[PDB]
């Protein structure tokens, strides 16, 4: 970007920039990802494939299209994009299950096979014991964990008293 | 004369602080 | 015996403890409610008795020690909240 | 309590010591602090009596224990769903009133600032 006035447009520049963006996605440094993306012209963001792929992957990751995130491996712009993809994928699974615990109250054992994108049924068992998922006799994983509600059972009387005391201060301490 | 001016300014600042403290105290008692 | 959070006695519990039939349990509570031994209400739909007050009884020394420990916790809470109010409203406190 | 002339004399004697500049709200909050202190003192007295009873310094009265059982029974459960919902609803009902009062106060303060600025501009214009 700096000496680009005298330097010619490198053929591999866009590919390597997309590689950097995909790496930033792999390390969950999305705030840096957008700042570095803004450095590119607004045209090649929607036009150049090497830039189009990582930004689309970011959109899919943010909106929750995890199936498209997994499919992004097949249509990578270049072979060099492969490695970072795996780095992202390990997150996606652990993210997907994070949804499953809070969204699905109970899911079948094989039903998650496409959801968790697991090839071997054996690969479910180790990931489940890592996740500590209580398998049910009917091949159903019971995710009963919403009982840990925001805990409205308790009144935050200390915080409320502090706020009211601050009101009293702002009404009296002014003088 | 630079040092004399600087020291006089320092004394003036400290005197102004004293005056403001006294004024606040006098307001506090003048309300009573 | 039950703590104040768990003073909802099922009809089965009273029937088993008092060696009486379930259908008589309500009547028993009536007497205890009429004399003044206990205070509360009866939810016959759920077959439960919500007891809220007991006739105070003679306590052992160990029970008095436990009561004093409860007072210790209560005093700790009162002191903590008093210090909190004093600290937060120090400027406006007279 | 004091008679009218007795109160006049007391206020004459307490003229310097008594500070009346503190607003009513500060007085009520200080009353709450004093109530907390008094409750702590009373509970500490009860705790000391129970400590003496436990070690045998005093015999079991069997009447103070009767009163203490009632005292501990009277301790309300603030963790109940119905009580928590009622407390939240009441707090919001009072907070909307506080909000309306503060909004009116802010508007009145803006009006006062308007009057002050207008008076200053008129004074500097005539001079």
The alpha-carbon gap from B22 to the nearest alpha carbon of chain D, in Å, equals: 18
In order of D71, D73, D117, the CA distances from D64 in angstroms are: 10, 14, 67
In order of A59, A100, D77, the CA distances from A165 in angstroms are: 45, 43, 25
Chain-chain contact of D87 with A172 (C-beta, under 8 angstroms):
no
User: Which chains sit next to A, with 3 or more Cβ pairs under 8 A?
Assistant: C, D
- Chain A neighbors of D26, CB-CB under 8 A: 168, 172
C42 Rama class: left (phi>0) / alpha (psi -120 to 50) / beta: beta
The total domain count for chain A is: 1
Joined together, the tokens standing for residue D25 give: 């709200």
CA–CA gap between residue C84 and residue C88 (Å, rounded): 6
Q: Which helix (H) or strand (E) holds C38?
A: strand C38-43
- Which class for A69: exposed (0-12), middle (13-18), buried (19 or more C-beta within 10 A)? buried
Chain C nearest-CA residue for D50 = C68
Dihedral (Cα; C76, C82, C87, C92), 10-degree rounding = 180
In order of A13, B32, D13, D14, D22, the CA distances from D8 in angstroms are: 92, 17, 9, 10, 20
Q: Which domain holds residue A30?
A: 1-170
Report if residue A175 sits inside a domain. no
Question: CA-based Rg of chain C, rounded to a whole angstrom?
Answer: 20
The alpha-carbon gap from C74 to the nearest alpha carbon of chain A, in Å, equals: 16
- Give SS3 for A2: coil
CA–CA gap between residue A94 and residue A73 (Å, rounded): 17
Joined together, the tokens standing for residue A143 give: 């995710």
In order of B28, C57, C64, C70, D56, the CA distances from D61 in angstroms are: 54, 12, 11, 19, 12
Chosen for mutation from D21, D22, D23, D26 (greatest number of chain B CBs closer than 10 Å) is D21
CA–CA gap between residue C24 and residue C47 (Å, rounded): 12
Chain-chain contact of D25 with A171 (C-beta, under 8 angstroms):
yes
CA–CA gap between residue A69 and residue D56 (Å, rounded): 75
Q: Which domain holds residue D112?
A: 65-124
Please give the DSSP secondary-structure letter assigned to residue A9: -
- Which class for D109: exposed (0-12), middle (13-18), buried (19 or more C-beta within 10 A)? exposed
CA–CA gap between residue A118 and residue C46 (Å, rounded): 48
Resolution in Å, one decimal, please.
Answer: 2.7
How was it solved? cryo-EM
DSSP assignment of D37-96 equals HHHHHHHHHHHHHHHHHHTTSS---SSHHHHHHHHHHH---TT-HHHHHHHHHHHHHHHH
User: Which chains sit next to C, with 3 or more Cβ pairs under 8 A?
Assistant: A, D
First vs last C-alpha separation in chain A: 58
- Give SS3 for D26: helix
Listed in order, strand segments (DSSP E) in chain A are 106-108, 140-142
D58 contacts chain C (CB < 8 A): no
Locus of tokens 């994108």: A117
Report if residue A89 sits inside a domain. yes
Q: Say if CB C54 and CB C3 are below 8 A apart.
A: no
Is B in contact with C (3 or more beta carbon pairs below 8 Å)?
Answer: no
Chain-chain contact of D65 with C58 (C-beta, under 8 angstroms):
yes
In order of A21, C46, C87, D51, D71, the CA distances from D44 in angstroms are: 66, 42, 22, 10, 14
- Compute φ and ψ for A154, nearest 5 degrees: -105, 130
C30 contacts chain A (CB < 8 A): no
In order of C1, D1, D69, D73, the CA distances from C4 in angstroms are: 9, 41, 12, 7
Q: Say if CB A58 and CB A22 are below 8 A apart.
A: no
Q: What is the crossing angle of helices A82-103 and A13-26, to 10°?
A: 30
D37 Rama class: left (phi>0) / alpha (psi -120 to 50) / beta: alpha
CA–CA gap between residue D22 and residue B4 (Å, rounded): 46
Chain-chain contact of D26 with A165 (C-beta, under 8 angstroms):
no
Locus of tokens 């506080």: D98
Joined together, the tokens standing for residue D111 give: 């009006």
CA–CA gap between residue B18 and residue C20 (Å, rounded): 85
D70 contacts chain B (CB < 8 A): no
């Amino acid at each position: 970007f700096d000496y680009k006035e005298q330097l010619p447009e490198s053929a591999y520049m866009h590919q390597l920039l997309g590689l950097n963006l995909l790496f930033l996605l792999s390390q969950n440094r999305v705030a840096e990802f957008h700042t570095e993306l803004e450095r590119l012209p607004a045209k090649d963001i929607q036009t150049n494939v090497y830039i189009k792929h990582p930004v689309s992957l970011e959109q899919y990751l943010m909106e929750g299209s995890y199936n498209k995130v997994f499919l992004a491996k097949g249509n990578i712009p270049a072979e060099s994009y492969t490695f970072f993809i795996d780095i992202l994928l390990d997150t996606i699974r652990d993210e997907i299950a994070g949804c499953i615990e809070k969204a699905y109250e109970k899911i079948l054992f094989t039903e998650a096979t496409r959801i968790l994108f697991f090839n071997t049924p054996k690969k479910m068992t180790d990931y489940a014991k890592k996740r500590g998922w209580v398998l049910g006799p009917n091949n159903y994983y019971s995710f009963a964990s919403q009982q840990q509600k925001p805990e409205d059972t308790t009144i935050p009387s200390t915080e409320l008293a502090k706020q009211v005391i601050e009101y009293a201060r702002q009404l009296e301490m002014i003088v | 004369d630079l040092y004399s001016r600087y020291k006089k300014l320092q004394q003036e600042l400290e005197f102004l602080e004293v005056q403001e403290e006294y004024i606040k105290d006098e307001q506090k008692n003048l309300k009573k | 015996t039950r703590p104040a959070n768990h003073r909802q006695l099922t009809f089965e519990e009273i029937a088993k403890s008092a060696k009486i039939t379930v259908n008589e349990v309500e009547l028993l509570v009536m007497k205890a409610l009429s004399v003044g031994l206990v205070k509360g209400s009866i939810d016959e739909v759920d077959k439960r008795v919500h007891m809220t007050w007991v006739q105070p009884r003679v306590l052992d020394l160990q029970q008095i020690k436990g009561m004093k420990d409860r007072l210790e916790f209560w005093c700790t809470d009162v002191k903590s909240m008093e210090m909190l109010v004093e600290h937060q409203a120090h400027d406006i406190l007279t | 309590g004091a008679e009218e002339a007795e109160e006049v004399g007391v206020e004459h004697l307490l003229r310097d010591i008594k500070d009346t500049t503190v607003g009513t709200l500060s007085q009520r909050i200080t009353n709450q602090v004093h109530g907390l202190k008094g409750l702590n003192s009373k509970l500490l007295d009860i705790r000391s009596y129970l400590e003496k009873v436990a070690t045998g310094k005093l015999p079991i009265n069997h009447q103070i224990i009767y009163q203490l059982q009632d005292v501990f029974n009277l301790l309300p459960d603030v963790s109940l769903q119905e009580f928590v919902k009622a407390f939240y609803l009441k707090t919001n009902d009072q907070m909307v009133v506080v909000y309306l009062a503060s909004l009116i106060r802010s508007v009145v303060a803006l009006h006062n600032l308007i009057n002050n600025k207008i008076a200053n501009r008129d004074a500097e214009k005539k001079e």
